[PDB]
């Protein structure tokens, strides 16, 4: 009744293939290792496509035409699947067969998704806000602010406009962190992390 662990035993045996969809085929379907990878693979799928549902307008409801080539692309470029995970998907889209169909209706949700992710996972005591910039978003930026009040009726991620304009980043995206909950200094765009 239990599913066999067939070629492995513990989770530590499957660490390397938890984000490699091309490596799921080498496990027996009836095995538990196949399902463990499928659970982890669906976690990447749902984190990307439940947060950015309009990406499914490009790939289709299965999302395979984006998911499988990106997961292979991210393993080659040694991505870390950090808070910049969504932004790297957009960078891959710019070199893919969907590059002609990329507009601001697709750029904005992935920008607020990366700001929202950094919001929830980052644990730097000295970092209160993240500011996301883009060459496809001049004059504005996406600001992710950690919670500093339990009674704030606003979203923690906002699109803000800059009076004096900010230089467009070198790559498609750029970021910088603020010590507090105010932007009084532009330190220079930092390149997107892995």
């Amino acid at each position: 009744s239990l599913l066999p662990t067939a070629p492995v035993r513990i989770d530590a045996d499957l660490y390397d293939d938890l984000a490699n969809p091309a490596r799921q085929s080498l496990y027996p379907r009836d095995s538990r290792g196949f399902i463990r990878i499928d659970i982890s693979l669906r976690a990447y799928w749902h984190t990307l496509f439940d947060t950015c549902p309009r990406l499914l307008e490009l790939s289709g409801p299965s999302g395979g035409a984006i998911f499988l080539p990106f997961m292979a692309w991210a393993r080659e470029n040694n991505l870390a699947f950090d808070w910049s995970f969504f932004l790297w998907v957009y960078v891959w889209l710019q070199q893919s067969e969907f590059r002609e169909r990329l507009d601001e209706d697709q750029l904005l949700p992935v920008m607020t998704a990366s700001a929202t992710r950094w919001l929830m996972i980052d644990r730097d005591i000295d970092a209160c806000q993240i500011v996301l910039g883009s060459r496809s978003l001049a004059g504005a930026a996406v600001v992710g602010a950690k919670i500093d009040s339990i009674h704030c009726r606003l979203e923690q991620v906002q699109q803000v406009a800059f009076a004096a304009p900010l230089p467009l980043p070198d790559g498609e995206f750029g970021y910088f962190l603020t010590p507090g909950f105010e932007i009084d200094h532009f330190p220079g765009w930092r390149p997107l992390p892995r």
């Binding site: 599913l3 492995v8 660490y15 390397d16 499928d38 659970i39 976690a43 870390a80 005591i125 339990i150």
Partner: protein
């Protein structure tokens, strides 16, 4: 036993305060690393009841000591201001060779000496007794986990935050009986419970989703072992971080007090 509820999202405050007013919960367990930047007094003044701390993304097994110490120092004064009933953390594999796992992995329980060293270092930084939660295993590591926690808790002085839903997932996924945790259940006074889902492509593999009411075997687990669970100062926190509506939580809380009534 005291019944608690986990406070994770800032938008659920109005419902949790109502649960306290109607005496549906006795305390509130918090994902305290999510609210590390707001004033610690304002958040103690938001709940007219005791609170408990639950740390999620400390990553003390792998985080750099410099950034880990900064988090501990901040959590230390949250402990000072609020005086939580307990402070709890996890044993989880977050990163493999630099890539972040979106489905967190069960650590290899054969790495005791490494886990023991990181646990004593993290418990020292928090300056209190730390409780560690068990994993809802999918692979066969569930069989060697009960003796792993009993050894870790014996040498480092940590407690165990026993999640009944997680052990029920382990029994369903690998056959490891929940009775392996009997000795831990009769020792620790703090517990977790929640509903669990199923793997999409396989209804036999169970996953901790915290989005449903409690299962049938999870309720029978608490019922037939109400003596080993119930103790002086015993607490159990119902977890629901997805599908957060008042009524599906209300029935599960009532089923919880139905198992553990006063004397």
């Amino acid at each position: 036993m005291q019944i608690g509820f986990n406070f994770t999202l800032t938008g659920t405050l109005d419902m949790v305060q109502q649960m306290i007013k109607e005496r549906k919960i006795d305390y509130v367990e918090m994902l305290i690393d999510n609210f590390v930047h707001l004033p610690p007094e304002q958040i103690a003044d938001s709940f007219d009841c005791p609170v408990a701390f639950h740390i999620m993304l400390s990553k003390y097994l792998e985080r750099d000591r410099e950034a880990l110490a900064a988090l501990g120092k901040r959590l230390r004064r949250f402990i000072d201001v609020m005086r939580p009933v307990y402070v709890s953390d996890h044993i989880l594999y977050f990163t493999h060779n630099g890539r972040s796992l979106f489905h967190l992995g069960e650590i290899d329980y054969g790495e005791y000496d490494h886990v023991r060293s990181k646990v004593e270092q993290w418990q020292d930084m928090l300056g209190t007794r730390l409780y560690l939660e068990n994993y809802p295993s999918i692979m066969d590591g569930a069989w060697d986990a009960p003796s792993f926690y009993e050894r870790l808790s014996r040498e480092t002085g940590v407690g165990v935050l026993f999640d009944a839903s997680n052990a029920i997932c382990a029994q369903n996924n690998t056959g490891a009986p929940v009775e392996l945790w009997k000795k831990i259940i009769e020792t620790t006074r703090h517990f977790h419970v929640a509903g669990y889902g199923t793997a999409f492509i396989e209804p036999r593999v169970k996953a901790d989703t915290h989005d449903r009411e409690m299962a049938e075997d999870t309720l029978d687990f608490l019922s037939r072992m109400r003596t080993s669970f119930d103790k002086p100062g015993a607490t159990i926190t119902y977890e629901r971080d997805f599908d957060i509506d008042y009524e599906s939580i209300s029935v599960d809380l009532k089923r919880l007090r139905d198992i553990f009534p006063c004397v």
